[PDB]
Design a protein around this ligand. Structure first.
Ligand SMILES: *[C@@H]1O[C@H](CO)[C@@H](O[C@@H]2O[C@H](CO)[C@@H](O[C@@H]3O[C@H](CO[C@H]4O[C@H](CO)[C@@H](O)[C@H](O)[C@@H]4O)[C@@H](O)[C@H](O[C@H]4O[C@H](CO)[C@@H](O)[C@H](O)[C@@H]4O)[C@@H]3O)[C@H](O)[C@H]2NC(C)=O)[C@H](O)[C@H]1NC(C)=O
Ligand SMILES: *[C@@H]1O[C@H](CO)[C@@H](O[C@@H]2O[C@H](CO)[C@@H](O)[C@H](O)[C@H]2NC(C)=O)[C@H](O)[C@H]1NC(C)=O
Ligand SMILES: *[C@@H]1O[C@H](CO)[C@@H](O)[C@H](O)[C@H]1NC(C)=O
Ligand SMILES: *[C@@H]1O[C@H](CO)[C@@H](O)[C@H](O)[C@H]1NC(C)=O
Ligand SMILES: *[C@@H]1O[C@H](CO)[C@@H](O)[C@H](O)[C@H]1NC(C)=O
Ligand SMILES: *[C@@H]1O[C@H](CO)[C@@H](O)[C@H](O)[C@H]1NC(C)=O
Ligand SMILES: *[C@@H]1O[C@H](CO)[C@@H](O)[C@H](O)[C@H]1NC(C)=O
Length: 269
């Protein structure tokens, strides 16, 4: 279970919905995937050897995104889904673009990073709001079975992943905009000497620095909240959620910059 507050008991079972296990996909950084721009520097028409937090080429992505309709499986809130954070993670996220009255809506899975997920520890939450990427790191009272809902098409159950009636004390709270039209979003989340770092990019594969947050504590776990939504199924609309995650580590990369400063290719030495 995540956290320890009894938020609800409606429609909970222990069914192993994942008859097909966690889907897997092979990392391939030959086209810049998993790389990020270096500080404020600019490199032109050259190849650089750089050491940083990058995915291991040839490793596997894991599709941790989960979609439900009415029932939540207790198995969703344990290993292997609840995963260790270690140095960090690289995330490749599909932007599930739905339509209501021919109006576009952007949805994708929420991710929570923390150590114990209780109101005496800080938990980082990255939640999309249809073009607005809300990021907070707050002492949330995380539920056993946190989950988000699908604001455009609705859901059969109310949204609940924290129970704080009063506003919890916390360190960071900001909103970042992202292009709702793009099909893929990339994120780097890693920690170093008690400081949390975040990079992202909604256009192009290489990511750019978002923010850094001092925590003074070691993050140990991350989890992708299941999403329950009436739509997003082959019986109503051929759309699916995807949240690919792979571990990060300190590795040396060969980075090639084109004549305009865009990382076009990379190699994992
Ligand atoms: C920070 O986070 C912690 C958890 O990590 C929160 O602590 C929990 O707070 C909740 C809500 O106050 C507690 O739940 C309540 O516990 C009361 C005491 O439980 C005793 O009595 C019941 C019988 O009533 C026994 O079964 C039990 O074993 C204990 O002996 C209950 O009396 C409460 O019941 C009332 O509310 C529920 C809500 O669903 C109703 O269903 C009931 O009918 C009744 O009206 C309630 O269950 C919980 O015990 C706390 N856990 C711990 C470990 O402390 C903090 O509240 C939170 N603080 C902040 C500021 O966010
Ligand atoms: C960041 O974005 C969130 C989500 O849109 C904002 O939170 C909403 O703010 C409006 C207006 O104050 C409220 O009516 C909503 O109830 C809030 N929640 C949601 C889920 O929409 C938030 O105000 C924005 N700004 C900051 C600083 O967080
Ligand atoms: C959570 O609360 C509901 C409603 O009070 C109760 O029926 C259920 O048994 C509780 N769950 C646990 C694990 O105590
Ligand atoms: C880029 O570098 C290559 C190899 O040195 C060179 O042939 C080419 O003219 C350069 N182009 C620009 C625009 O710098
Ligand atoms: C959702 O919230 C509404 C408003 O409080 C309530 O009427 C309804 O019963 C709730 N349903 C569930 C499944 O929580
Ligand atoms: C948003 O993404 C679409 C599709 O990738 C692109 O055509 C458009 O120019 C982008 N707009 C902005 C402001 O990034
Ligand atoms: C989804 O695609 C399959 C295969 O093309 C098709 O049989 C099915 O009717 C589609 N469902 C919807 C809701 O479009």
């Amino acid at each position: 279970v995540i956290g320890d507050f009894n938020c609800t008991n409606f429609a909970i079972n222990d069914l192993n919905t994942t008859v097909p296990g966690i889907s897997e996909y092979v990392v391939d950084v030959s086209y810049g995937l998993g790389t990020y721009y270096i500080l404020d520097r600019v490199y032109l028409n050259t190849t650089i050897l750089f050491t940083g937090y990058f995915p291991k080429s040839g490793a596997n992505f894991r599709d941790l995104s989960l979609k439900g309709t009415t029932y939540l499986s207790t198995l969703w809130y344990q290993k292997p889904f609840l995963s260790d954070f270690n140095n960090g993670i690289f995330s490749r996220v599909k932007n599930t673009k739905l339509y209501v009255n021919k109006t576009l809506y952007s949805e994708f899975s929420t991710i929570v990073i923390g150590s114990v997920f209780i109101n005496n520890s800080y938990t980082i939450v990255v939640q999309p709001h249809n073009g607005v990427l809300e990021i907070t790191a707050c002492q949330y009272t995380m539920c056993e079975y946190p989950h988000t809902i699908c604001k455009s098409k609705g859901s059969s159950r109310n949204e609940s992943w924290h129970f704080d009636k009063s506003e919890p004390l916390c360190l960071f709270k900001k909103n970042f905009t992202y292009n709702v039209s793009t099909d893929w979003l990339y994120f780097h989340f890693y920690q170093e000497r008690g400081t949390f770092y975040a990079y992202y990019a909604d256009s192009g594969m290489p990511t750019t620095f978002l923010f850094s947050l001092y925590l003074g504590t070691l993050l140990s776990h991350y989890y992708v909240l299941p999403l329950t939504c009436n739509a997003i199924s082959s019986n109503t609309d051929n759309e699916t959620l995807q949240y690919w995650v792979t571990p990060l580590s300190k590795r040396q990369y060969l980075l090639k910059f084109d004549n305009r400063g865009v990382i076009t290719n990379a190699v994992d030495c």
